[PDB]
Amino acid sequence: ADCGLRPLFEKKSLEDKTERELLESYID
Amino acid sequence: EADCGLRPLFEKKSLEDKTERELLESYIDGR
Amino acid sequence: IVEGSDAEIGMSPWQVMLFRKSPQELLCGASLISDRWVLTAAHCLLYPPWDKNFTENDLLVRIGKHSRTRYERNIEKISMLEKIYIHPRYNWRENLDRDIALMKLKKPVAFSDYIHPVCLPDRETAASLLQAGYKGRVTGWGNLKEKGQPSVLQVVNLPIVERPVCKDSTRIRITDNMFCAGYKPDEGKRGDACEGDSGGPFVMKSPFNNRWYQMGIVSAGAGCDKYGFYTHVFRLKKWIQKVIDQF
Amino acid sequence: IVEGSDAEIGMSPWQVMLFRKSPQELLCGASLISDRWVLTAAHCLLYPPWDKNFTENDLLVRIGKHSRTRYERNIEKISMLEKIYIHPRYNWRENLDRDIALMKLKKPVAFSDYIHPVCLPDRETAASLLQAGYKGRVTGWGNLKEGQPSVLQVVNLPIVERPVCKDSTRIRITDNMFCAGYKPKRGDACEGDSGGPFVMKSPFNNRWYQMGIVSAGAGCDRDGKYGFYTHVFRLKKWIQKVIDQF
Numbered sequence: 001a002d003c004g005l006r007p008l009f010e011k012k013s014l015e016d017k018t019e020r021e022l023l024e025s026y027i028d
Numbered sequence: 029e030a031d032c033g034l035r036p037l038f039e040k041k042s043l044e045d046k047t048e049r050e051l052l053e054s055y056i057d058g059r
Numbered sequence: 060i061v062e063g064s065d066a067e068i069g070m071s072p073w074q075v076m077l078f079r080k081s082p083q084e085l086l087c088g089a090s091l092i093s094d095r096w097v098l099t100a101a102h103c104l105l106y107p108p109w110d111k112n113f114t115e116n117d118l119l120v121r122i123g124k125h126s127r128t129r130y131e132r133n134i135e136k137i138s139m140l141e142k143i144y145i146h147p148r149y150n151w152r153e154n155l156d157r158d159i160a161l162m163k164l165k166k167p168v169a170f171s172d173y174i175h176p177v178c179l180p181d182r183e184t185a186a187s188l189l190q191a192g193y194k195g196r197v198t199g200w201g202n203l204k205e206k207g208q209p210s211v212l213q214v215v216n217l218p219i220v221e222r223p224v225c226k227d228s229t230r231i232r233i234t235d236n237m238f239c240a241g242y243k244p245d246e247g248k249r250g251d252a253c254e255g256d257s258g259g260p261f262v263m264k265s266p267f268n269n270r271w272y273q274m275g276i277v278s279a280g281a282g283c284d285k286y287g288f289y290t291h292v293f294r295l296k297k298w299i300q301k302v303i304d305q306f
Numbered sequence: 307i308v309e310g311s312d313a314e315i316g317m318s319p320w321q322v323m324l325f326r327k328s329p330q331e332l333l334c335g336a337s338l339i340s341d342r343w344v345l346t347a348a349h350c351l352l353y354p355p356w357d358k359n360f361t362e363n364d365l366l367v368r369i370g371k372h373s374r375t376r377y378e379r380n381i382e383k384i385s386m387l388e389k390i391y392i393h394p395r396y397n398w399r400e401n402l403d404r405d406i407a408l409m410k411l412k413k414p415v416a417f418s419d420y421i422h423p424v425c426l427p428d429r430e431t432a433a434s435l436l437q438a439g440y441k442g443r444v445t446g447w448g449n450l451k452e453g454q455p456s457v458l459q460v461v462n463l464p465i466v467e468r469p470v471c472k473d474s475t476r477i478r479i480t481d482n483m484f485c486a487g488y489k490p491k492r493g494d495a496c497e498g499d500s501g502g503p504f505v506m507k508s509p510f511n512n513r514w515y516q517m518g519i520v521s522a523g524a525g526c527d528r529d530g531k532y533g534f535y536t537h538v539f540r541l542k543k544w545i546q547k548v549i550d551q552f
Contacts, residue, residue, distance in 0.1 A: 003339075004425035004513025007418070008316035016317050021462055022507055025441035029093055033178035033270030036171070037069035045070050047196075050216050051264055054194040108354075206476070231357065282356075 060199050060213035060256055061284040062249040068125055071198045073177035073273075074212060076121040077103060077258055078137075079113075086113075088199045088259025090273060091122060091176050094167040096303060099258030100278050100290065101149040101160045108151065115140040120162070123173035125211050127200040134173055141165040144302050146295075154231045158278040158290045161302055177262060178272045185293035188263045188274060191221040195240060195263045195274055195289075201255025205283030215250045217241055217261075220286055228285055236294050238275060241286035253283035261289045307448050308527040309493025310461030315372055318445045319417075320424035320516070321458060323368040324350060324501055332374065335446040335502030336367060337516055338423045341414045343549060344385075346501035347519045347536060348396045348407045355398065362387040367411065370420040372457050374447045381420055386412040391548050393541070403480040405521040406536045408548050424503060427515045432539035435506045435517060438467040442486060442506045442517055444533075446499030452526030461493045463504075466532050474531060482540050487524050487532035495523025495533045504535045 005011055038045055053059060075089035075097050089099035097120055104113045123135040141163040150156045168174060180188075198214045217240040225239035233239070240261065242248045252259065261275030275289030292299075322336035322344055334350035344367055351360045371382045388410040397403045415421065427435075435442075441464045447455055463486040471485035479485065486504070487494050495502065504518040518535035525531055538545075 001423070001425070003423040004508075004511075004515060005422070006316060006319055006514070007420075007422055010512055016314055018311075018460075018462060019507055022441045022443065023509060025439060025464060026435070026509060028439075029176060032073075032092075032176040033265075033268075033272060034175070035069060035072055035271070036175055039269055045067055047064070047214070047216060048264060051194050051196065052266060054192060054216075054218060055188070055266055057192075 060197065060201055060209070060215050061203060061205070061251045061253045063203075063213035063215035065210070066125070066198060066212040066214040069172050071212065071214065071260075072123070072173055072175040073260065074124070074198055075099070076124055076200065078119050078121050080117055080119060085127070085200060085255070086118070087255070087257045088201070088277065089120060089162070090260045091168070091174065092179060092273070093176055093303075094170065095164050097162045097164070098273070098276065098299070099160055099162065100276055101145050101158045102151060102155055102278070103258045104143060104160055105145050105149070106151045115143045115162075120164070122168055123171060125173075127209055127211060136168055136174065138164045138166065138168060142306070146298060154233060155278050155288070156234050157236055157295065159276055159295055159298070161299065163306065177260060178270050179296055179299065180272050180274055180293040182293070184265055184267070184272055185274065187267070188265065188272070189219065189238065189293075191219055193263070194218045195261045197252045197256060197259060197261050197277060199252065199256030199259045199277070201280070202253045202283060205253065215252075217250055217287075225286055233288065236291050237278065237288050238291050239286040239288055241281050249284050251282075251284045252277045252280045252287050254280050256280060307444060307446055307455070307459035307461050307493070307499050308450060308452065308496055309491065310444075310459040312456075313372070313445060313458040313460040316420050317460065318458065318503075319370070319420055319422035320503060320514075321371070321445055322346075323371055323447065324365060325368050326365050332447055332498070333365060334498070334500045335520060336409070337503035338369060338415070338421070339426055339516070340423055340549075341417065342411055344409045344411060345503070345516070345519065345545075346407055346409065347521045348392050348405045349398060349402050349521065350501045351390055351407055352392055352396070353398055360390070362390050367409070369415055370418060374455055374457060383415050383421065385415055388412045393544060401478045401480065402521050402534070403478075404482050404541065406519055406541055408545065424505060425513050425515045426542055426545065427517055427539045429539065431508050431510065431515055432517065435508065435515070436465065436484065436539070438465055440465050440506070442504050444495050444499065444502060444504055444520060446495065446502035446520065448496040448499030448523070449526060450496070452496065452528060463487055463494065463533070471532060479534065482537050483521065483534055484518060484537055485532040485534050490529035492527040492529065494525070494527050495520045496526035497523065499523055
C-alpha cells in the first residue's frame with residue numbers, strides 16, 4: 001500500500017486542475 | 029350492471045370531461 | 060399516479076379504494092363492476108414474497124370517494140367483504156401471471172352520481188380498442204413521484220405499447236394475459252401508474268356506444284415514471300364470469 | 307454527475323466501471339482499494355423493488371478507463387468477478403442503510419499509470435476530514451442533465467451539516483452515511499454514478515482517501531436535496547473482516 005498516490009500526478013509532483021479547491025475548503 | 033360505463037354526471041348529461049377527448053384523438057389519430 | 064391531475068368529481072364512479080382495517084391504511088385501488096362485485100389485482104390480497112395474504116375480514120372497501128383522506132359524509136359507502144376469490148392460476152413467484160381477483164360485498168351497494176359500474180370488454184370492443192398508440196385511462200390515490208400523497212384521486216392517460224417493445228425493455232416473462240402501456244422515452248410525455256394505484260382500472264371509452272370499458276388492471280406499476288404491466292381483462296372475462304355465476 | 311467537468315487522464319486511477327455482460331450496459335461505479343478487491347454500493351447488485359440480484363457472472367469490471375464508450379486499447383483491463391459480498395444489515399426497504407459491498411476479482415490486476423488503488427480512511431484522517439463545509443470529490447459516468455457523458459466526469463462537493471441533512475430529507479439517514487452538496491454552484495452525483503468513490507486528499511500525507519460511497523446522489527442537482535453517501539470509515543470494520551477472512 002502505496003495507495004492514494006497517483007502515478008501521473010503525486011508521483012511526478014504535479015497537481016490536478018482542481019485539487020487545490022479541496023485543500024482550501026479544509027484550510028477554511 | 030346493464031347501464032354501465034355510463035357516468036351520471038357526464039354521459040347521462042351529455043357533458044365531456046377535461047381529458048376524455050385525448051383518448052378519442054388517440055383512436056382516430058392527431059389533430 | 061405520476062404526472063397525473065386532479066380528477067373531476069364523478070369522473071371515475073367505479074373507482075374503488077381497498078382499505079385495511081387494523082391498522083387503517085390504503086392498500087390498493089379497485090373497481091365496481093356490479094352492485095356486489097369489485098375487481099382488483101391479486102398481489103393486493105396475496106403475495107408470499109412480502110409475507111402478505113389478507114383475509115376477507117382484514118379489509119373493507121370504500122366506494123364513491125374523491126379525497127384520499129377525508130371521510131366523505133353522505134358521499135362514500137363503506138363495505139365489508141363477504142368472500143374473496145384470488146385467481147386459480149395466479150403466480151406470484153415470477154411475473155404475476157393472471158394478476159386478478161374478485162371480491163364480494165356482504166351487502167349490495169346503492170348507485171349514485173359518485174357510485175356506478177364500469178363495463179367489461181367484449182371481443183369486438185377488445186379488438187377495436189386494444190391497439191398500440193391507443194390510449195387508456197388510469198386513476199388512483201398512489202404516490203406522485205418515485206408528501207408524495209395526492210389530496211384527491213389522480214388521473215392520467217397512457218398509450219398501449221406493442222407487445223414486441225414491451226417484451227424487450229423488461230427481462231421478466233410477460234404472458235399474453237397482460238399488455239403494457241406508457242410512453243417510449245421519445246415523447247417527453249411523463250405519465251404512469253405509481254405504486255399504490257395497483258388493482259386500479261385501465262379504462263377506455265368506446266366510440267361505438269359511448270360507454271366506458273375496463274380493458275386492464277394495474278399490476279406492476281411501471282415504477283413511477285420501462286412500461287407498466289396491466290392484466291388483460293378480456294382475455295380473462297371467462298374466469299371473471301365463471302366465478303360470479305357460481306354465486 | 308451534474309455541473310461537473312471532464313476528468314484529466316489518470317486523475318482518478320482507482321475508478322472502476324461495473325459492466326453488465328448481456329445486456330451490454332454500464333451498471334454502476336466502483337473503486338479499486340487493492341489489486342484484488344473492488345468496493346461499491348450495495349444497491350447496485352441487489353435491490354428487489356427493481357428485481358436486481360446479480361450473480362458473480364452477470365457482470366465484469368473495467369479498470370483504468372476514461373471514455374464511457376470506446377474500448378481503450380492497452381489501457382483498460384477487463385476483470386472478472388470471483389465472489390460478491392453484500393453487507394448483512396443492508397436495508398433497502400427502509401433507507402439503503404449500510405449500502406455497501408465488496409467484490410473480489412478473479413485474478414489480481416496489474417497497476418499502471420492509469421490504474422492505482424485508493425486508500426481507505428482511518429479514525430484519524432476520517433475524524434479530521436469529515437467536517438461540514440469540507441469538500442470531497444465524486445466521479446462517474448452518470449447522466450449529465452436534470453444526457454450521456456463522453457468521458458469520465460468529475461465534481462467536488464462540500465459536506466453538509468448532519469442537522470441540515472436529516473432535515474431536508476424525509477428519510478432516516480443512519481450513522482453509516484452522510485450527505486454532501488452545495489446549498490440553494492450546483493452539481494452532484496446523478497443516478498448511475500452510484501458505487502462511485504467519494505474521495506478526499508489528506509494534507510497529512512498527500513494520499514487520496516475514499517471517505518464514502520455514492521448511494522443516493524441528490525437527484526441530479528435540483529436545489530433542495532443533498533446526495534447520500536456511505537460512511538466508508540464507520541464500515542471499514544466489516545471491510546476488513548471480509549478481506550481478512552478472505
